[PDB]
Amino acid sequence: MYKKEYVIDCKGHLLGRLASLIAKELLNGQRIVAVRCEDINISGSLYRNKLKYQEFLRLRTNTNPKKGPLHLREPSKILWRCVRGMLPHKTYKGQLALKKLKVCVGMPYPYDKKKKYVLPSALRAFRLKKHRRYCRLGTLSSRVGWNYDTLVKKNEVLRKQVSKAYYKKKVNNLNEKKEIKTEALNLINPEQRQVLENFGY
Amino acid sequence: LQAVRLYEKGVILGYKRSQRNQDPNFTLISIKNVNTKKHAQFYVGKRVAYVYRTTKHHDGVKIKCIWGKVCRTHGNSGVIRAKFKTHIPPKAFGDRVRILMYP
Amino acid sequence: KQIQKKELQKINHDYYKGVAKAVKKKKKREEKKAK
Amino acid sequence: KATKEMLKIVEPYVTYGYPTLSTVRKLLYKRGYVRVGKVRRYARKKIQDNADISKHLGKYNVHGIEDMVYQLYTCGPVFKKVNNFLWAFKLKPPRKGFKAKRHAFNEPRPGDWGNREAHINELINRMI
Amino acid sequence: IDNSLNTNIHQYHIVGRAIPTAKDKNPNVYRMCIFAKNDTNAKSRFWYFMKKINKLKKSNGELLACEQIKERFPLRVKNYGVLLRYDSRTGTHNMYKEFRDTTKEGAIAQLYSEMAGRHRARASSINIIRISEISSSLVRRPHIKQLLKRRLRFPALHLPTLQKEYRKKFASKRPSTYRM
Amino acid sequence: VELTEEEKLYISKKNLLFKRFVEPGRLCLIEYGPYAGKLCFIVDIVTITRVIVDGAFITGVPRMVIPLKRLKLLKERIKINKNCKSGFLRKTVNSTKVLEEFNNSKLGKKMIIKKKRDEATDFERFQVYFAKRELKKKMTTIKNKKN
Amino acid sequence: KTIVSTQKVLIPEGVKVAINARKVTVSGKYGTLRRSFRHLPIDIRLNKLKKYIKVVMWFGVPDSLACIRTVCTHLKNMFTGVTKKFLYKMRLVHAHFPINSNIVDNNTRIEIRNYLGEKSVRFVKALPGVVIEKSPNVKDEIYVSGADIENVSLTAALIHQSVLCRNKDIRKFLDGIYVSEVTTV
RNA sequence: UUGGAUAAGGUGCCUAAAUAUUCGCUCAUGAGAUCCCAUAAAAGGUGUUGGUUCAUAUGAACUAGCCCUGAAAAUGGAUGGCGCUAAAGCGGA
RNA sequence: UUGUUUUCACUUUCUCCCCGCACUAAUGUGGGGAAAACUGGCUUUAUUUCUUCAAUUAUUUUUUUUGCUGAGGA
């Protein structure tokens, strides 16, 4: 809302709730970059969402399909269109809000180590009954003709290993910082020690 | 460091409007860390400054501020209505305003 | 106000006895007509 | 009997009930307006004094808002010269709002119109 | 006290009689006790039931005293019994009812939400009659027997519900669903 | 017949995935609603969601009924009778000092730190800042020395 | 409708298990066990000196309480299946053309011929670790067996539907590849 | 005209205001979603819950809420759109 | 043709015992019995700030922080 830009990991996020929240942020003026859109999940069976997308696919302008609704198959573009359908893109302010949004499949280069945020209002674990049926946007998009799911998965696993390496570096950095803190506490004057102790610092 | 702030951040949301109908006398304002009406009521009567930049100087200065104050809360999600000396230009939605400590 | 609360208790307990006896009569009539 | 019968035909468009003393006092003190002008030229005026009350009723010895409340609650011998003398109250909309103007106050579903009996004091002092 | 959880039902008891007429020089007096949303609502329901069961209304009925005979202890824990009668979109059906709460006021009212949710029976279609007290062992309902068992337990796997204070939109990372 | 050691060890070793039995006698601190911030006792259970939670006079909470959705109970427990009333509640609470045994866990310590941190005046806020400043001085001094 | 359901599954002597987050890992005689049952809300209690499993379901409503029964009898039943192999009674049938078998590559990638006389190729597989091989007692009989209950049963399942013909009344032409009875080693 | 408060109606985004609280029901391989209003019927329903009647925790019959079949039309298509299933659906409070 | 009056059957427990004897969800359970009653209620005595004094209604009196308005000119 007030940050320069918010990066959202779309993994395990319900499409409609995520789109509504993101669109509200764009309208309020907060720049949003959405990553890993191919792990967005949609309520209802995968066959149900496949039928819905087939019904959307069979729909085009009869006279000239060029101006027909550009269907788009990438999950990032699907999320972008869902967000666009949530805000007044026909107006200037709505167009600005729409252009204030970036969507990516996987995690591209300038999103390796900026904090990916998660909005619990759109989590599957909190917004869907466990015994009910859900889908996966990457799988649905591959079914409707994306043919890039596997490449994103291989890039994601390579990124997993890459990030794990420097997380293992960071944990040792933090646990040496805490132990130097333990010894530096007793080099501070006692009255300054008391305030830190009783304020939990 | 330098350049103290001692104010709270706010975003200019839409006018005090309904569906397909506005009332530009009041402008809706969102505040940095307020999310309920019960503490949105805390910032009532406080001065509100909208500070913006002009293309060219007007008093040897490229900066102009229009004043106002928050009258009462709007809804129950930490949104307020602010009345300004003039009407907030609609080119300024989503911009930043200062909710000042004084009064 | 012990006397006043006692009188109120007496009136309320008369109400309670009336309700209990009405319950008894309702049950007796239902039992009689059940067969 | 007569006015109750004539009001029953208009029940679905009004809500009515017991006023009680504090509420009648509030209504007369903060919303009470009085026809001070001459017959058929009444020129609605807020009370703000007892001079007009005495001018219209002093010869009939019910002069004073003290007496007007003293008389409106317990319906004594002078209701003609009190109700008709008093301008119709122009109330504000309820502070918290109506429940359903379309439905009766007496139906199990939320509703407004009908006889609130003793429950109209809260509505009046919310609307005042 | 929390207003959101509470309903709006209190105790009352108002006594009267049909009008003594020339034909009926000495009419008998009668009474009955129900609770509803308001005292006026309960009076209207009582007069409706009087018109449905006998022949009398405000035109031929009057009341001669009013009191609020509240319960012995509203903080008690009870098990009572009433009789339900309702109508569907094609007929009418009847049964009994019993439930546990602190007092009769909500004991009357916990049923309407269940009825509306299950059978879509709006409150204008249900009739509740003859409130009394039930036993704890005589209940043949499935759920209510374990209510007064000697010892019982189950987990708390319900989803969290935080304040508007702390229902922060952007989270540092994904929360879990274990708690405790 | 009785077996001792195996049952005694497996009670601890079973590591059952669910804990905090809802038996009468537990302590509670509400999570949602106007009453989030008070300490009470789970007197009994009335249904699946609604439960009976009542405080002690020392803690000062009247009788209440709350849905299970808004709850977060405590690990303590006393051994009162099922019908024990406010005369015995104030005795059984002080019999074992039910509050003392809680405010040392991680969550309790965090809550106390937050409670004493938000109520911090400007003077102690600046004291915390200055203590952090001196601690950072020592940080960098010995970090440079460690090379 | 009540709030707890459970099945006190009896652990036989010849099996040792370890539960972890609805992922029970077990060791018997022919091998080890594991299972992906993450669809269903299941909690498990375990003991190993006194044995017996307790698979439970909290807030047990008959809407899904028919699943704990399935998983519980299934659990005891894979215990039995891995301890002692299960044997269904599969018999090939042939009204006119006796069934031609080409058991190529050790119970893996079997081929079927001589069924109505098509004289073509027909090959149907099965899950690895499960045998469906000729019983020497009778030629037209195959002694199906394997590691686990589902392991044997899906193999006994897929095979029947492999060679179906067309336009021939099966009320009169009783051709098929049948499975009749169940026994143990 | 300036403030306040409301009516009808709404409070997931479009769109100002509840991803509000509380209790149930429903999974639809064409779910459903505000009077007029923008169609749906006879005939089938051991899912859910609660009943009623009967024969010694044991079997039936019905009953009615949601869901399903019945249910096919021509430019591509419309709960207003997006979408929504721990509802943003239905019946309450 | 109402009233009135009468009988048993009801509750607490970390009580205890025995049988399945560990079969408990638990630091127990299924069944059959003993215990007092630390549950509980009943009447009192000085006190309600050790501790509750609730809720609703009727009748009164204040209070924190603040929005908008200043007609007139006797």
DSSP characters over chain C: -HHHHHHHHHHHHHHHHHHHHHHHHHHHHHHHHH-
CA dist list (Å): G20 to D62, F23, G17:
90, 27, 10
Angle at E57 between CA E53 and CA E63, to 5 degrees: 110
Strand H nucleotides, any atom under 7 Å from protein beta carbons: they are: 2-9, 12-25, 27-31, 47-52, 63-66, 75-77, 81-88, 90-93
G window 103-142, beta carbon within 8 A of A? none
CA dist list (Å): F69 to A124, E180, F16, F43:
19, 13, 22, 17
Nearest nt to the CA of F7 via C1' is I22
Antiparallel, parallel or unpaired: β D15-17 and D114-117: parallel
Query: DSSP class of residue G53?
Result: E
CA separation for the pair A13, E171 (Å, rounded): 13
Q: Cβ(B68)–Cβ(B82) under 8 Å?
A: yes
Q: Which pairs count as long-range contacts for E119-124, CB under 8 Å and 24+ apart, including other chains? A: E119/E86, E119/E88, E121/E86, E121/E87, E121/E88, E122/D108, E122/D109, E123/D108, E123/D109, E124/D107, E124/D108, E124/D109
SS3 assignment, position G161: helix
Q: Cβ(D69)–Cβ(D82) under 8 Å?
A: no
At D125, phi and psi to the nearest 5?
Answer: -75, -15
Answer yes or no: do E153 and F23 touch at CB < 8 A.
yes
Which residue is it, tokens 């915390």?
A: F128
The two tokens of residue G140 are 């037209």
CA dist list (Å): E21 to D68, D126, E27, E62:
38, 43, 8, 12
CA separation for the pair D62, D74 (Å, rounded): 14
Q: Of G76, G92, G95, give the one whose Cα is nearest residue G173.
A: G95
Q: CB G87: neighbour CB atoms within 10 A?
A: 19
CA separation for the pair G156, G178 (Å, rounded): 9
Q: CB contact, 8 Å: G23 with chain F?
A: no
The whole-number Å distance from F80's CA to I35's C1' is 18
Which residue is it, tokens 């709460």?
A: E101
Answer yes or no: do F33 and E2 touch at CB < 8 A.
yes
CA dist list (Å): F35 to F38, F62, F73:
6, 11, 13
- Amino acid found at A85: G
Q: Cβ(G45)–Cβ(F18) under 8 Å?
A: no
Start-end of H helices in chain G: 65-83, 149-158
Q: Cβ(F126)–Cβ(F100) under 8 Å?
A: no
Closest chain E residue by Cα to residue F51: E101
CA dist list (Å): G107 to G110, G149, G173:
6, 18, 29
CA separation for the pair F145, D44 (Å, rounded): 91
CA dist list (Å): F59 to A65, F44, F64:
72, 19, 14
CA separation for the pair D64, D53 (Å, rounded): 6
Cα-Cα-Cα-Cα dihedral sign, residues A43, A45, A46, A48: negative
| Distance to chain A for F17, nearest Cα, Å | 18
Tell me if there are at least 3 CB pairs under 8 Å linking chains F and D.
no
Cα-Cα-Cα-Cα dihedral sign, residues E127, E131, E136, E138: negative
Angle at F56 between CA F53 and CA F57, to 5 degrees: 140
Tell me if there are at least 3 CB pairs under 8 Å linking chains D and E.
yes
CA separation for the pair G29, A147 (Å, rounded): 45
Ranges assigned E (strand) in chain F? 26-29, 39-45, 50-55, 63-67, 73-77
D111, with CB counted inside 10 A (0-12, 13-18, 19+), is middle
CA separation for the pair D18, D73 (Å, rounded): 10
Radius of gyration from C-alpha coordinates of chain B: 14
**End-to-end CA, chain D:** 29
Q: Of A110, A134, A102, give the one whose Cα is nearest residue A8.
A: A102
CA separation for the pair B48, B88 (Å, rounded): 12
CA dist list (Å): G134 to A123, G101, G140, G175, G184:
54, 10, 8, 19, 16
Cα-Cα-Cα-Cα torsion C8, C11, C14, C16, nearest 10 degrees, comes to -50
SS3 assignment, position A193: helix
Q: At a CB cut-off of 8 Å and minimum separation 6, what does B1 contact?
A: none
Q: Cβ(E43)–Cβ(E50) under 8 Å?
A: no
- Mutation test of the interface with chain E: which of G2, G56, G57, G61, choosing the one with the most E Cβ atoms within 10 A? G2
SS3 assignment, position F59: coil
Query: DSSP class of residue E148?
Result: G
| Distance to chain A for E158, nearest Cα, Å | 10
Rounded to the nearest angstrom, the gap between the alpha carbon of residue D100 and the centroid of all alpha carbons in its chain is 22
Strand I nucleotides, any atom under 7 Å from protein beta carbons: they are: 3-4, 10-14, 21-30, 38-41, 51-60, 65-68
Q: Of G143, G34, G132, G28, give the one whose Cα is nearest residue G82.
A: G28
- Mutation test of the interface with chain C: which of E34, E53, E67, choosing the one with the most C Cβ atoms within 10 A? E67
Q: At a CB cut-off of 8 Å and minimum separation 6, what does G79 contact?
A: G9, G11, G12, G15, G26, G28
| Distance to chain F for G171, nearest Cα, Å | 56
Tell me if there are at least 3 CB pairs under 8 Å linking chains F and B.
no
Statement: the CB of D23 is under 7 Å from strand I: yes
Q: Of B5, B7, B11, give the one whose Cα is nearest residue B78.
A: B11
- Residue A2: its chain B contacts at CB < 8 A? 9, 11, 32
Elucidated via: cryo-EM
G24, with CB counted inside 10 A (0-12, 13-18, 19+), is buried
F window 39-58, beta carbon within 8 A of G? 48
CA separation for the pair E162, F71 (Å, rounded): 10
CA separation for the pair A53, A15 (Å, rounded): 14
Antiparallel, parallel or unpaired: β G110-113 and G100-103: antiparallel
Q: CB contact, 8 Å: F6 with chain G?
A: yes
